[PDB]
Ligand binder design. Structure first.
Ligand SMILES: NC(=O)c1ccc[n+]([C@@H]2O[C@H](COP(=O)([O-])OP(=O)(O)OC[C@H]3O[C@@H](n4cnc5c(N)ncnc54)[C@H](O)[C@@H]3O)[C@@H](O)[C@H]2O)c1
Ligand SMILES: NC(=O)c1ccc[n+]([C@@H]2O[C@H](COP(=O)([O-])OP(=O)(O)OC[C@H]3O[C@@H](n4cnc5c(N)ncnc54)[C@H](O)[C@@H]3O)[C@@H](O)[C@H]2O)c1
Ligand SMILES: C[C@H](CCC(=O)O)[C@H]1CC[C@H]2[C@@H]3[C@H](O)C[C@@H]4C[C@H](O)CC[C@]4(C)[C@H]3C[C@H](O)[C@]12C
Ligand SMILES: C[C@H](CCC(=O)O)[C@H]1CC[C@H]2[C@@H]3[C@H](O)C[C@@H]4C[C@H](O)CC[C@]4(C)[C@H]3C[C@H](O)[C@]12C
Ligand SMILES: [Zn+2]
Ligand SMILES: [Zn+2]
Ligand SMILES: [Zn+2]
Ligand SMILES: [Zn+2]
Lengths: 373, 373
């Protein structure tokens, strides 16, 4: 079949910052030892993929981006034991080698084999993609905006064969990150007051986790008032737009919560909202979690007295989940109806319309657009 | 005999920043409702009292500083029920009203009735001290650099009648703060690697707590190498002087710990060491606690990606302990030989030689100087 052969297929190649993805033919090499070649079925558009196009994130170009997705194994290289041809899988943008000291720690999830922004390759340092005869870089070891991709085994998890890939691709990034940020990283408590800054796909998933944790109050914060209705549908008890007030938003949230909230989340990616989210939590016992990706080459300025009083400030990737252990469990929980993903899906488009999906996100009109291959 | 009447005694008044304390005759009013007048027996010289003199901390002047101390109750105002004349007590620079949101919270200890720097008075907004035809401000509700002081009842804890006050005054600030920072705020784990920046009285107490928690490695960091022998006596496994290295201290500690420490503590009061302490903790699961007091009105600058990878940054006052509940317990623990205080006392002087005590601290030769009244 195609096993052992170079596959020619369609992919979305980003050749330059601030330009449209180029949908064109690429050559995908067969998998080497401990690698998995996957036929993609659905991919979501995450704001971090847009960060590569705007320069917010600096990744080596040209590149095949995409990290929130699901597909079916087409073939495996020598030594693969955790997946087989025909299995439904989700690529893991943070790997889980299971042997490093972070993988063995009870709370860490940033596996030391992670391939972050500067490392635009597979684990062996090379690429499996060619376009117009030129080598193309990988992204986060996943590169899912392609009809076929090749990933390292520690970067892929087998999931339930009955799951709907057009929905569960969100477990690869958006949903898990927000939900885990509330239930695992902040460990929101029953009856608490939470403030969530940013009501995109990840922020809505933080609201779902605060509601599942039993929070009594969930204040959504966004400058785009069109995001409020969906936020309330999934759990927000109130929504506030910072542009409607004469005072800084942290002052407004502190007054609203009678002294500061128990848990706050920054799910935007701005330095001023990271500082405001910290400030609006209660000065002695509040907890603030940074989920948004800050702008490249910019430092945050803050008064350390905000921490000395007793606040906890922390960040996390992928909701704190150890990726290969958690993604299959999250898909099984979805199959058991333990959470819902339809509230995050506002648009469905064929993969070929990827640029239209990115323009929907940039214009503020969508939450998650799912691309179907 | 002195109950209900003004007491004329000596106190150390600070009339101007960067000047010596003046031992002067002051008038101490009798205690009003729910107030306790205390005969001081011993007071420790903490670097935060020196911060008032240097301008690192801004407090309304003139002022009677002092907040680490122990004494005996001389008289009680109307309604007092938790202490009686003749009881040994430790003034609490952070109160425990028992009724506010923080006091009712399981982890929080900055009671909403705390009198911080701008609030140079008793709880009722007035002063009990007069000197040279003028009212003198209080400091942290305690003002212990006086033969007699008056404190609100939510700011005083009764302790064991057989307690050695010349030693347990350190439970009023340095010891408790450092020890709690490790065992209650950071919750140091057995077998972990800790880094302690600053080896003064509070840093040595942090080392005592990390050793009590079973850390496997405790790295003391100080630019004054004369502080290393005592740090190793109380538990440090190694000491490093940043001046001996070409690289910044956070990189040195990251290498020493093969990727970052589990727990780091800033116990100095500098913006750059607060950022260095956060950077030297492990990027996915490290915890950094800010204990030092930074300079007034100055923000720090940092890369938020230090937190997005998974680090936790927090600060705490008085080791996270709820004060009225914890001070008597810590004194009982001292009487039962659960911890030691002599390692922190390097010098003893009469109260009349307070300026010499501050000169000792500023010269780098002392850890804690205990003043006897
Ligand atoms: N930590 C992680 O593992 C991880 C995973 C996913 C996404 N992310 C990051 O999380 C952030 C959210 O991702 P997303 O896909 O939900 O994005 P999104 O663009 O869909 O949502 C961002 C929301 O922030 C709102 N917003 C923008 N500026 C604002 C301001 N100044 N004040 C208040 N609201 C404002 C926008 O209106 C929008 O609704 C991004 O920075 C993304 O890169 C981090
Ligand atoms: N959070 C609280 O509740 C609390 C309570 C007590 C004290 N404090 C603060 O804790 C800090 C320590 O107090 P202390 O009484 O132990 O003070 P201290 O002056 O005895 O000790 C500070 C130590 O830091 C060292 N130091 C200075 N600059 C340094 C540098 N660049 N690198 C490495 N080491 C350096 C000094 O040599 C010294 O040994 C002070 O800022 C004080 O205000 C906070
Ligand atoms: C996981 C996320 C992209 C996925 C997404 O945001 O949707 C990426 C974007 C920026 C990345 C971070 C930046 O490259 C900065 C850091 C680089 C270090 O080598 C690892 C942690 C580090 C903090 C990275 C962790 C993780 O790879 C990040 C946070
Ligand atoms: C407790 C400590 C003084 C005693 C000690 O340092 O030894 C004092 C010095 C500076 C004070 C801090 C500063 O006044 C800044 C903040 C003021 C807020 O109103 C309470 C928290 C706040 C963060 C204060 C908490 C506490 O009163 C501090 C931290
Ligand atoms: Zn993402
Ligand atoms: Zn690993
Ligand atoms: Zn209280
Ligand atoms: Zn002190």
């Amino acid at each position: 079949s195609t096993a052992g052969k170079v596959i020619k297929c369609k992919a979305a190649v980003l050749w330059e910052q601030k330009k449209p993805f180029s949908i064109e033919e690429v050559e995908v090499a067969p998998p080497k030892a401990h690698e998995v070649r996957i036929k993609m079925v659905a991919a979501g558009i995450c704001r971090s993929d847009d960060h590569v196009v705007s320069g917010t994130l600096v990744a080596p170009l040209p590149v095949i981006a995409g990290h929130e997705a699901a597909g079916i194994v087409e073939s495996i290289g020598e030594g693969v034991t955790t997946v087989r041809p025909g299995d439904k899988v989700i690529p893991l943008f943070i790997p889980q080698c299971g042997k490093c000291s972070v993988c063995k720690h009870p709370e860490g999830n940033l596996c030391l084999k992670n391939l972050s922004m500067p490392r635009g390759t597979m684990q062996d340092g090379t690429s499996r993609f060619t376009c117009r005869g030129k080598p193309i870089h990988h992204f986060l070891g996943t590169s899912t905006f392609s009809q076929y991709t090749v990933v390292d085994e520690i970067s892929v998890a087998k999931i339930d064969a009955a799951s709907p890939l057009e929905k569960v691709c969100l477990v690869g990034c958006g949903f898990s990150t927000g939900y885990g940020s509330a239930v695992k990283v902040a460990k929101v408590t029953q009856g608490s007051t939470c403030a969530v800054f940013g009501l995109g796909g990840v922020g809505l998933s933080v609201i779902m986790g605060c509601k599942a944790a039993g929070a009594a109050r969930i204040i959504g914060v966004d400058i785009n008032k069109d995001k409020f209705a969906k936020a309330k549908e999934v759990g927000a008890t109130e929504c506030v737009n910072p542009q409607d007030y004469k005072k800084p938003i942290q002052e407004v949230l502190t007054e609203m919560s009678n002294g500061g909230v128990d848990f706050s989340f920054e799910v935007i990616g701005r330095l001023d909202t990271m500082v405001a989210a910290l400030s609006c939590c209660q000065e002695a016992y509040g907890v603030s979690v940074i989920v948004g990706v800050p702008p490249d080459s910019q430092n945050l300025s803050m008064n350390p007295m905000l921490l000395l009083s007793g606040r906890t400030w922390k960040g996390a990737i992928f909701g704190g989940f150890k990726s290969k252990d958690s993604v299959p469990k999250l898909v099984a929980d979805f199959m058991a109806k333990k959470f819902a993903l339809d509230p995050l899906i506002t648009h469905v488009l064929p993969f070929e319309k990827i640029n239209e999906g990115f323009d929907l996100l940039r214009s503020g009109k969508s939450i998650r657009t799912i691309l179907t291959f």
